[PDB]
């Protein structure tokens, strides 16, 4: 069958529900912290300690 016949390729399955929504919530947390740092260092700033 290595020479005559053939097959078909998909090459992408994970199917892990809890892992998928962990990845989605981690990406949401990353977007939160990224925009947090962005407009944290962008605009008018008052800190918690001195010069955070």
């Amino acid at each position: 069958x290595x020479x005559x016949x053939x097959x078909x390729x998909x090459x992408x399955x994970x199917x892990x529900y809890q892992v998928l929504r962990e990845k989605a919530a981690s990406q949401r947390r990353d977007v939160e912290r990224a925009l947090t740092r962005f407009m944290a260092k962008t605009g008018e700033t008052q800190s918690l300690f001195k010069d955070d």
Binding site: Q27, A34, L35
Partner: protein, 257 residues
């Protein structure tokens, strides 16, 4: 959700707005984002369509903004950029073509900034030739068809010579070397004859600058540095003895270590 398009709106308004501190901070932001994808299709689509619009509108500042945007896309060790490279290869290289529809002098210096965009093309060729080998072959065939033929403006010849300059050592050794002399005779036809085509004159002048100060070290490696006038006779006169002088400067820079 909602924060995706908020980040997209603010990052495109930082891309268009000329706040220079916010410019550099957004570039370092894109360079330092862990896990910033799924916006990358809309990011690259905005890049390609903004390249088309800025080719139509001839705004060099938005062009260098988009090239720094591509540079910031390059400097992330997390972005598997592979599947979207087919959108970045036109969007950069359409910038390395366009038909001199701007103003002349300082935009010729901005064509040198598009040679820095050809350095970006060199970084793409360094990081993405792992395909069933197509990318470097496609870019070298495109640069060859730009470089060889006549009816090619100085923007196209300039960008082709700049891209083949950025591709590296044996590109200059094997592809520029044979018809170096014929394009030198083309510039000699631009020289010594008519006067009032100064776009083409200054274009051929810094074409000569690229040719000299990038083809000097490969001839310094191959050809031995006696016989400066014989090296000029072997390389159509006009390169020598500035070819041998820049070869001596490259030997001094190599011996500087």
């Amino acid at each position: 959700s909602v924060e995706q398009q908020l980040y997209y709106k603010e990052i495109t308004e930082a891309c268009v707005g000329s706040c220079e501190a916010k410019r550099a901070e957004a570039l370092q932001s894109i360079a330092t984002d862990p896990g910033l994808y799924q916006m990358l299709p809309r990011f690259s689509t905005f890049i390609s369509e903004g390249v088309r619009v800025n080719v139509v509108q001839n705004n060099l500042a938005l062009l260098i903004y988009l090239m720094r945007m591509v540079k910031a896309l390059m400097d992330n060790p997390t972005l598997y950029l592979e599947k979207y490279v087919h959108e970045l290869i036109p969007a950069v290289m359409t910038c390395i073509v366009s038909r001199q529809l701007c103003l002349r002098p300082d935009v010729d210096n901005h064509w040198a900034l598009r040679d820095f965009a050809a350095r970006l093309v060199a970084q793409i060729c360094k990081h993405f030739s792992t395909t069933t080998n197509n990318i470097q072959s496609r870019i070298t065939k495109t640069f060859t068809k730009s470089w060889v033929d006549e009816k090619t403006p100085w923007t196209t010849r300039y960008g082709s010579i700049a891209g083949l300059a950025e591709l590296g050592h044996d590109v200059i050794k094997t592809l520029i070397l044979p018809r170096l002399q014929q394009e030198g005779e083309r510039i000699r036809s631009v020289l010594d004859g008519p006067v009032l085509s100064n776009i083409d004159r200054i274009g051929a002048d810094h074409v000569q600058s690229l040719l000299l100060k990038h083809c000097a070290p490969v001839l310094a490696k191959l050809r031995p540095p006696p016989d400066n006038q014989d090296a000029y006779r072997a390389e159509f006169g006009s390169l020598g003895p500035l070819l041998c002088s820049q070869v001596v400067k490259a030997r001094a820079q190599a011996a500087l270590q």
